[PDB]
């Protein structure tokens, strides 16, 4: 208790605990019931310690239900920027809104799923199937949010990698894979002093996550987590199991509104009858209060004056200037995939056809589908709990129209997905931009026959067939794709008239502004893929399973698999084009700390794991004729002394903006953990001590420009 930065918080918490009755304690750990409070979850106020009715509110990309809030870009769009400054700023901006509404706990960001299964329906909420990128995104988002004064909640712990049967299936993950891959972003989150972690709906090793003692042995033991664990909604199964496993808060308290509470008086009964220790409830409360005090919510926090259930009305307008970071991520997370002799940026075309319903806002209304449970009109968010009501949505045509008008280009509109009207409009313009999508969401909503998870890696809404129609009647086609995740693009790429493919992602309210910022060339695209785009779906080596998942692929997920199995992707992890080119030189690598690392336990694990032990640099030069930013990447290969591992693992990235002909330095600081592996034999992290690490610096997981090594001492 009080390890790391939490000692003053725990002191305040322990003092408060001493004033509480057992009924006070029970009310702090037991949600009031589904929809009974104004938030997605609440616990009762405890006036004797000045504790409010704690407010838990969705979701990761904006405040759910409440009006006059910002609908920020998705997690995966945010990761696609590879820009820690933007990542931090989105978290700050979200947390500013949450605090201003009196939200105590904002339910994000998302470390689980990482997205090991490309079809899985919630992967867009997260931060990629690369644990290093994911972890940097987690820590910068949390630090932002909590700097604004809200408690963040890293979710969903753990192994909820598909929506299909998520509340009955088991994920059974071997020790090494668990630590190196799926745990890794949660460990970064804990090191960044995340206030809370939510346990998942699925079984892990055959026991429900919220009933599994790993909450105590891994989160609170190995990782020395000082905050509190909250259930996913109605993910608690038993009174005694959950308490004893290490759950701290049961949300929403009952089984989605059934008025039956496994904790409440039932938990007091379990204590009275000897099956749960008083010390366990005391520990739960101490943790919840510690997190409250840790982010400073005990003095001068705003009150909730709105409800989730009355249309989201009653609160102040909290949008502030947050559209700025929303636009910057909508822009800078776009990934340019192809661009044949400078098709883009556009430059005063005489005429332009605009094709696809994705070009315009949903004609029925941008918030007309409950929880964004449709793929109709412009797609800027997936569906489920990780949503918000758009205050407005800039569709591509909204942004393009004035820009085209100023250049006197004529627009030929075909804003449905009709293939005949599409070919018709394509024939009538010099250049055609066609807009296609792919969507998915949380597994309580079915859209186009898909209950959360996607049933293929094909474009939705007959998108491939739309593009084929446009290509059949035009010599100059630009494809814009708004998708929640990887798609197989081989049919589109086989079309000789497709001159540029813009992977624009799913980017919130400012989507169409960010897109135009790139299409008309005000800014060079600088995004890089945060997942692999394969040539066929079977190449990922993962898929949605019908029963339990034993994770046989182990460590080898996304590019790690393509690399280990020698499968050429179509577009690799970390790939992205620019309107310029970059050249890399001058690699340096230096061990700055060859010592033994501290074994004193702190949140995140042994403190020495996070010491900076080495630094790598390189020089990057803009070799082209326009300005652009490049995302330099560092991949590490472990020595032969280590067990068999992916050939390359991302361990650094740095984004540099350069004017034409200019040069700068990129820097990658390596933690001891970044140079380690999990040794199941000794049940700990090992840092190799003979041989040499291989260092690969370049523009992608496969566009490696520099190579070096770090002697392992
Ligand atoms: C899950 O089961 C695997 C294989 O049995 C086991 O070795 C691993 O340690 C388990 N992890 C737990 C309980 O956290
Ligand atoms: C203890 O109380 C809990 C909560 O009501 C109940 O489920 C359990 O059956 C009780 N056990 C015994 C041995 O009384
Ligand atoms: C949003 O805020 C504006 C600006 O204060 C206000 O006039 C408008 O009524 C608010 N809308 C809702 C639904 O509260
Ligand atoms: C429309 O726009 C494209 C892309 O800029 C051009 O390459 C084409 O010639 C047409 O003008």
Author numbering: 1 to 713
What does the paper say about this structure?
D2-BGL is a GH3 β-glucosidase from the indigenous Taiwanese fungus Chaetomella raphigera. β-Glucosidases (EC 3.2.1.21) finalize the cellulolytic process by hydrolyzing cellobiose into glucose. Crystal structure analysis revealed that D2-BGL belongs to glycoside hydrolase (GH) family 3.
There are three intra-domain disulfide bonds involving residues C39–C55, C199–C210 and C369–C374. Three N-glycosylation sites (N68, N205 and N273) were determined by the presence of N-acetylglucosamine after endoglycosidase H (Endo H) treatment, and one O-linked mannose was observed on residue T431. The N68 and T431 glycosylation sites have not been observed in crystal structures of other reported GH3 β-glucosidases. In D2-BGL, residues D232 and E442 are nucleophile and general acid/base residues, respectively. D58, R122, K155, H156 and W233 form the substrate-binding subsite −1. The hydrophobic substrate-binding subsite +1 is formed by W34, Y444 and F256. Structure alignment revealed that all key amino acid residues lie in the same positions for both D2-BGL and AaBGL1, except for the phenylalanine involved in substrate-binding subsite +1 (i.e., F256 in D2-BGL and F305 in AaBGL1), in which the two aromatic rings have different orientations. The connection loop between the TIM barrel-like domain and the α/β sandwich is shorter in D2-BGL than in AaBGL1 (12 a.a. from residues 307 to 318 vs 29 a.a. from residues 356 to 384). This loop plays a role in forming protein dimer in AaBGL1, but we did not observe that dimerization state for the D2-BGL crystal structure. Another short loop is close to the active site entry region in D2-BGL (3 a.a. from residues 166 to 168), which may influence the efficiency of enzyme catalysis by broadening the active site pocket.
